[PDB]
Design a protein around this ligand. Structure first.
Ligand SMILES: *[C@@H]1O[C@H](CO)[C@@H](O[C@@H]2O[C@H](CO)[C@@H](O[C@@H]3O[C@H](CO)[C@@H](O)[C@H](O)[C@@H]3O)[C@H](O)[C@H]2NC(C)=O)[C@H](O)[C@H]1NC(C)=O
Ligand SMILES: *[C@@H]1O[C@H](CO)[C@@H](O[C@@H]2O[C@H](CO)[C@@H](O[C@@H]3O[C@H](CO)[C@@H](O)[C@H](O)[C@@H]3O)[C@H](O)[C@H]2NC(C)=O)[C@H](O)[C@H]1NC(C)=O
Ligand SMILES: *[C@@H]1O[C@H](CO[C@@H]2O[C@@H](C)[C@@H](O)[C@@H](O)[C@@H]2O)[C@@H](O[C@@H]2O[C@H](CO)[C@@H](O)[C@H](O)[C@H]2NC(C)=O)[C@H](O)[C@H]1NC(C)=O
Ligand SMILES: *[C@@H]1O[C@H](CO)[C@@H](O[C@@H]2O[C@H](CO)[C@@H](O)[C@H](O)[C@H]2NC(C)=O)[C@H](O)[C@H]1NC(C)=O
Ligand SMILES: *[C@@H]1O[C@H](CO[C@@H]2O[C@@H](C)[C@@H](O)[C@@H](O)[C@@H]2O)[C@@H](O)[C@H](O)[C@H]1NC(C)=O
Ligand SMILES: OC[C@@]1(CCc2ccccc2)NC[C@H](O)[C@@H](O)[C@@H]1O
Ligand SMILES: [Cl-]
Ligand SMILES: [Cl-]
Ligand SMILES: [Cl-]
Ligand SMILES: [Cl-]
Ligand SMILES: [Cl-]
Length: 842
C-alpha cells in the first residue's frame, strides 16, 4: 500500500514537521527521501469523500460527497454538495460547497468529457478529441475543513504557467515547488508571495493543445507542484469553485478565461505614450523642468507623474503650499501643451489630525467607510502620514465616499488618472497599532508559505471586519476592489476612459486597471526577469503592464538604462520611475550616444502606437493578449515552450532584447517563416529565413532587434513629442510579404478617450490586404473619427525584383525607391485610410 513512486507521493504532513509514529498514527506512509519530496504521504487507501446519489439535471450533474473518517485538520465538513455545470462547449464549471451553511464566495458536443470516481471521490476531465486526461482529482484525497481545502490533479505535461504574482520563469518548476498567493508588499524576489494573486494556470499538452483551470477562491493559498506531474490547491477558506477551459489553442484558453473574469479595459490612447515619474520631484518648478528638459532633448513624454512629493504631510487629496503651492496651474499648463498628469494615491487615510481639519478622514468616519476591529472602531495602522484607517472598498458607502473625495480633489487639480499604490493593503506595523486578537482567523490551522510566516505580516488583522466578510476572506481582493472604486470615481469625475495603474491585483483586475511590477532593483537580473512577468500578466488579462524602466531601487548604469529603455519601449505600459535616494535616470540625464539610443527606442514606440492601440482593441473585444510569449503564437513548435526572454507584440512583431551587460549580440529563437528586420522600414540580414531555429543577431548598444513576420501589415504614424501631436500626423503601412506575395493587417481608430465607443459605433476599422503586387484597404466601418486619416507612405518588404511602374489608384506615383540589397519598395502616396485605394507595381 506504501509502494508509491517518489514523484507521486502527496504530502500527509503539510501542516508541521512529523515523526514516523505520528505519520503512521494519521494513517499515512513514512519513507525518508534518499537525498522537496514528502517523507509522510497518503497511501492510495487514505480516507477521502465518497460520491453518493449522482443525478443529472438540465443544469448538469449534482451529488452528495460524504467523509466517514475525519482528517488531522479541525472542523472537517463531512457532507458536501457537488454541482457540475457544462456551461459552453469550451467551459466546464464545478463547485464543492457545504449544503448546510453559506460559506464565503468571491463576488464576481463539448471539447471535454467528465466522469467521476466513487470512492475515493474524483472528477476526471478528458479532452474528447485525443482522450488526454486533463484533470483527475482522484490522485489524492479531497480535504474540506472550515480553514483547509485541498484538491489535487494530475497535470498533462511538465509545462504550466500562471499563479501570479511571483518572480519566476514563465514556465513554473514542477520540482516540489510551493507557490503562495497572499498579497504582500515586498520587493520582487524569487520564492515569495508578491503584490497580487491569480489562481489560474494554463497547462500545455504534447502536440501544442492546452487547457486552463481557474479556482475562484480569494483566501490565502499554497499551490504545490510535483514532478509526477501533479498540482495541489491548498486554500485556507471559502469553497472549491473550479473552471476548466478547453482551448484547444493557448490563445483560446486565455480568451475563455477572460470570458469568465472580464476582457481587458480599453485604455486612452495617451496612456500608451511615455510616462515619467520619480520620488523626489519635490516642487512644481522641478516637475516642470522635467518636461522642459525632455522637450529640449527631443524626447516624447505624454504623462508627467508625481509621487508623495505633491501631498501635504503625505496625505491623500491634499497638496502642500511650499513646493506645490501652484499645483493646479502646473497641471493646467501640462494640459495646454497636450500632456496628461498622474499622481500617486494611497488607500490609507490619516486618522490623527484634529477633528474637522481633514475631510477625507472626517467624512470617512461619518459615513462608516473604514475597516473595523473587534470593538467596532476603525482599525488603525501606520503608513506614510503616520496613523491611518483603511477604507473598505466592499462597502457601497465607501465607494460613494471615494467617488466624492476623487471628484472634489479633481475640481482643485485636474489629474487624468490615478496611480494606486500600497493596496495589498500595506502596513508599516503588524496588524494594527493595537495588535490583533488571538483567534482562529489570526492564527489558522494551516498557514501558507507567506513571507514572515503570518497572514498579518506587513498588513492588517485577518479578523478585521469588511462589509462583505472578514479581511481573512477578502485580503487578496483589496487592491482589485480599490481599482474598481477608482475606475468608477474617474468615470464620474472626468466623463472619459479611466487610467488606473495598481500595485496589488487579483484575477479579473484587467477589466478595470493596469499594473506595474513594483519595487524592482536596477539590475540586469531584474531587466531579464521583467520579460516573463510582463508576458505572465498578458496571459492573465492585464495587458496594460510594465516594469519601472531602468529599474526602481538603487542606481541604474548608463548601459543598463539603454538596454532597459530599448526593451521597456515594448512594455504595453511604459513608465520610467525612480526611488528617492537614486541617481537621476531621465533620458536627458545620460551621455549623447545613450540619449540617441533612448530617443530611437521612444521614436519607434510612438511610430507603432496605432498598431499597439489596435492590439489593445483586440484584447478589449476578443480577450487577446498584447505582449505574448512565442508559445502562444507557435504552440505546435515545442522549441518555443521555454522561451521567455523574447516577446511578440500580437502575431507579427518579434522583439529579441539584449538582457546582459557587455553584449554586442543576442541569440533568439525564430519560428518557421520569414522575419524582416524592422530597421529596413523608414521611420545584419534584411530577412531571416527560419526553418524554426536559434539565430545569433548583431546587437550593438544602440540597437534592439525587432523583426516583422511575413504575411502581416502594420499601421504606423508620424512623430510627435506627445500623442496629441503624433495623432495629427500622416500614417504609413509596413507590408511584410510572404514568399507568395500576400499580407494582411488592420487598424482600429477612435477619438482616443471617449466611453462606450464600440456600443455607439464611434470608430473606424480598416483591413489592409496585399496579393499579386497590389495593396488595398477594406472598409469595415468608417465614421468621423478616422475619415480624415492620411496615408503618405507604403513600405513593402520582400519585393524580389525592381518594379518598372508603381500606380496609386491607376496613376503613376510621384516618387518610389527600390533597394535591390534589402528587397524593400518604398512608395510616397497621398491616400486616405477611410477611402478605397489600390496601390500596384510590376
Ligand atoms: C485518475 O487517477 C486515479 C488515481 O491515480 C487512477 O486510478 C488508479 O489507476 C491505477 C492504474 O490503473 C489503479 O491500479 C491498478 O488497479 C488494478 C485493480 O486493482 C490492478 O489490477 C492494477 O495492477 C493496477 O495497479 C488504481 O487502482 C487506481 N486507483 C484508484 C484510487 O482507483 C485513474 O486511473 C486515473 N484516471 C484516468 C482516466 O487516468
Ligand atoms: C480598535 O481600534 C481602536 C481605534 O479606532 C482602538 O482604540 C485604541 O485603544 C487604545 C487602548 O486600548 C488607546 O490607547 C490609549 O491612548 C491614550 C492616549 O490617547 C492613553 O492615555 C492610554 O494609556 C492608552 O494608550 C488608543 O488611544 C485607541 N486609539 C485611538 C485612535 O483612539 C481599540 O483598542 C481597538 N480595539 C482592539 C480590541 O484592538
Ligand atoms: C441518497 O438518496 C437516498 C434516497 O433519498 C430519496 O430520493 C431522492 C431522489 C430525494 O427525493 C430524497 O429527498 C429522498 O429522501 C437517501 O436514502 C434515504 O434517506 C432518508 C433519510 O435518512 C430515509 O428516510 C430513506 O428511507 C432513504 N431512502 C432509501 C431508498 O434508502 C440517502 O440518504 C442519500 N444519501 C446521502 C449520503 O445523502
Ligand atoms: C534640467 O536640466 C538642467 C540643465 O541641465 C538641469 O540644471 C543643471 O543641473 C546642473 C547639474 O547637472 C546644475 O549644477 C546646473 O546649475 C544646472 N544648469 C542650468 C543650465 O540650469 C536641471 O537640474 C534639470 N532638471 C531636472 C528636474 O532634471
Ligand atoms: C546611489 O548613488 C549615490 C551617490 O553616489 C555617488 O555618485 C555616483 C555618481 C558615484 O560616483 C558614486 O560612487 C558616488 O558615491 C549613493 O549615495 C547611493 O548610496 C547609491 N545607492 C546604492 C544603493 O548603492
Ligand atoms: O510612494 C513611494 C513608493 C516607494 C517607497 C520606498 C520605500 C522604501 C525604499 C524605496 C522606496 N511606494 C512604493 C511604490 O512601489 C513605489 O513606486 C513608490 O515610489
Ligand atoms: Cl462570510
Ligand atoms: Cl467584460
Ligand atoms: Cl452583507
Ligand atoms: Cl514566408
Ligand atoms: Cl497617391
Amino acid at each position: 500500500q506504501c509502494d508509491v513512486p517518489p514523484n507521486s507521493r502527496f504530502d500527509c504532513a503539510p501542516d508541521k514537521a512529523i515523526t514516523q509514529e505520528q505519520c503512521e498514527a494519521r494513517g499515512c506512509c513514512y519513507i525518508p527521501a534518499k537525498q522537496g519530496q514528502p517523507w509522510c504521504f497518503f497511501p492510495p487507501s487514505y480516507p477521502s469523500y465518497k460520491l453518493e446519489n449522482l443525478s443529472s439535471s438540465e443544469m448538469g450533474y449534482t451529488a452528495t460527497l460524504t467523509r466517514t473518517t475525519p482528517t488531522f485538520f479541525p472542523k472537517d465538513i463531512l457532507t458536501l454538495r457537488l454541482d457540475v455545470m457544462m456551461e459552453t462547449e469550451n467551459r466546464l464549471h464545478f463547485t464543492i460547497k457545504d449544503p448546510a451553511n453559506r460559506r464565503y464566495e468571491v463576488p464576481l458536443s463539448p471539447l471535454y468529457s467528465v466522469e467521476f470516481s466513487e470512492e475515493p471521490f474524483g472528477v476526471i476531465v478528458h479532452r474528447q478529441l485525443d482522450g488526454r486526461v486533463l484533470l483527475n482529482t482522484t490522485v489524492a484525497p479531497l480535504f474540506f475543513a472550515d480553514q483547509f481545502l485541498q484538491l489535487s490533479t494530475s497535470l498533462p505535461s511538465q509545462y504550466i504557467t500562471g499563479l501570479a504574482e511571483h518572480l519566476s520563469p514563465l514556465m513554473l518548476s514542477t520540482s516540489w515547488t510551493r507557490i503562495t498567493l497572499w498579497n504582500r508588499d515586498l520587493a520582487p524576489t524569487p520564492g515569495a508571495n508578491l503584490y497580487g494573486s491569480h489562481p489560474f494556470y494554463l497547462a500545455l499538452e504534447d502536440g501544442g493543445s492546452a487547457h486552463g483551470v481557474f479556482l475562484l477562491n480569494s483566501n490565502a493559498m499554497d499551490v504545490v507542484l510535483q514532478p509526477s506531474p501533479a498540482l495541489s490547491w491548498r486554500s485556507t477558506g471559502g469553497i472549491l469553485d473550479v473552471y476548466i477551459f478547453l482551448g484547444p489553442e493557448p490563445k483560446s484558453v486565455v480568451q475563455q478565461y477572460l470570458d469568465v473574469v472580464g476582457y481587458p479595459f480599453m485604455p486612452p490612447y495617451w496612456g500608451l505614450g511615455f510616462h515619467l515619474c520619480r520620488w523626489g520631484y519635490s516642487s512644481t518648478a522641478i516637475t516642470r523642468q522635467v518636461v522642459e528638459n525632455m522637450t529640449r532633448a527631443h524626447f516624447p513624454l505624454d504623462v508627467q507623474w508625481n509621487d508623495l512629493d505633491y501631498m501635504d504631510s503625505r496625505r491623500d487629496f491634499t497638496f502642500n503650499k511650499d513646493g506645490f503651492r501652484d499645483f493646479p496651474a502646473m497641471v493646467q499648463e501640462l494640459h495646454q501643451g497636450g500632456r496628461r498628469y498622474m499622481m500617486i494615491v494611497d488607500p490609507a487615510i490619516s486618522s490623527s489630525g484634529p477633528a474637522g481639519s481633514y475631510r477625507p478622514y472626517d467624512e470617512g468616519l461619518r459615513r462608516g467607510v473604514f475597516i473595523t476591529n473587534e470593538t467596532g472602531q476603525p482599525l488603525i495602522g501606520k503608513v506614510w502620514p503616520g496613523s491611518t484607517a483603511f477604507p473598505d472598498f466592499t462597502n457601497p458607502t465607501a465607494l460613494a465616499w471615494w467617488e466624492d473625495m476623487v471628484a472634489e480633489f479633481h475640481d482643485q487639480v485636474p489629474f487624468d488618472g490615478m496611480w494606486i499604490d500600497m493596496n495589498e493593503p500595506s502596513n508599516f506595523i503588524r496588524g494594527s497599532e493595537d495588535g490583533c486578537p488571538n483567534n482562529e482567523l489570526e492564527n489558522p490551522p494551516y498557514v501558507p508559505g507567506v513571507v514572515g510566516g503570518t497572514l498579518q505580516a506587513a498588513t492588517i488583522c485577518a479578523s478585521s471586519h469588511q462589509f462583505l466578510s472578514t479581511h481573512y476572506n477578502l485580503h487578496n481582493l483589496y487592491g482589485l476592489t480599490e481599482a474598481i472604486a477608482s475606475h468608477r470615481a474617474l468615470v464620474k469625475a472626468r466623463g472619459t476612459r479611466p487610467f488606473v495603474i495598481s500595485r496589488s491585483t487579483f484575477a479579473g483586475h484587467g477589466r478595470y486597471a493596469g499594473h506595474w511590477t513594483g519595487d524592482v532593483w536596477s539590475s540586469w537580473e531584474q531587466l531579464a526577469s521583467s520579460v516573463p512577468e510582463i508576458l505572465q500578466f498578458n496571459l492573465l488579462g492585464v495587458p496594460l503592464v510594465g516594469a519601472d524602466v531602468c529599474g526602481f531601487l538603487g542606481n541604474t548604469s548608463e548601459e543598463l538604462c539603454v538596454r532597459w529603455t530599448q526593451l521597456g519601449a515594448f512594455y504595453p505600459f511604459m513608465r520610467n520611475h525612480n526611488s528617492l535616494l537614486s541617481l537621476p535616470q531621465e533620458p536627458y540625464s545620460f551621455s549623447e550616444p545613450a540619449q540617441q539610443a533612448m530617443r530611437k527606442a521612444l521614436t519607434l514606440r510612438y511610430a507603432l502606437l496605432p498598431h499597439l492601440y489596435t492590439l489593445f482593441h483586440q484584447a478589449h473585444v476578443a480577450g487577446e493578449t498584447v505582449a505574448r510569449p512565442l508559445f502562444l503564437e507557435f504552440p505546435k513548435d515545442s522549441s518555443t515552450w521555454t522561451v521567455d526572454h523574447q516577446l511578440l507584440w500580437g502575431e507579427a512583431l518579434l522583439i529579441t532584447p539584449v538582457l546582459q551587460a557587455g553584449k554586442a549580440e543576442v541569440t533568439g529563437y525564430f519560428p518557421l517563416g520569414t522575419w524582416y528586420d524592422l530597421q529596413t522600414v523608414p521611420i545584419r540580414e534584411p530577412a531571416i529565413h527560419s526553418e524554426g531555429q536559434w539565430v545569433t543577431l548583431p546587437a550593438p548598444l544602440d540597437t534592439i532587434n525587432v523583426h516583422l513576420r511575413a504575411g502581416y501589415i502594420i499601421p504606423l504614424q508620424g512623430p510627435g513629442l506627445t500623442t496629441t501631436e503624433s495623432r495629427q500626423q500622416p500614417m504609413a503601412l509596413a507590408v511584410a510579404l510572404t514568399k507568395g506575395g500576400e499580407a494582411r493587417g488592420e487598424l482600429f481608430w477612435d477619438d482616443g478617450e471617449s466611453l462606450e465607443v464600440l456600443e455607439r459605433g464611434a470608430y473606424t476599422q480598416v483591413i489592409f490586404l496585399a496579393r499579386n503586387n497590389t495593396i488595398v484597404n477594406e472598409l469595415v466601418r468608417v465614421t468621423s473619427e478616422g475619415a480624415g486619416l492620411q496615408l503618405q507612405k507604403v513600405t513593402v518588404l520582400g519585393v524580389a525584383t525592381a518594379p518598372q511602374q508603381v500606380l496609386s489608384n491607376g496613376v503613376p506615383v510621384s516618387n518610389f525607391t527600390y533597394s535591390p540589397d534589402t528587397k524593400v519598395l518604398d512608395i510616397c502616396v497621398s491616400l486616405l485610410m477611410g477611402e478605397q485605394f489600390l496601390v500596384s507595381w510590376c
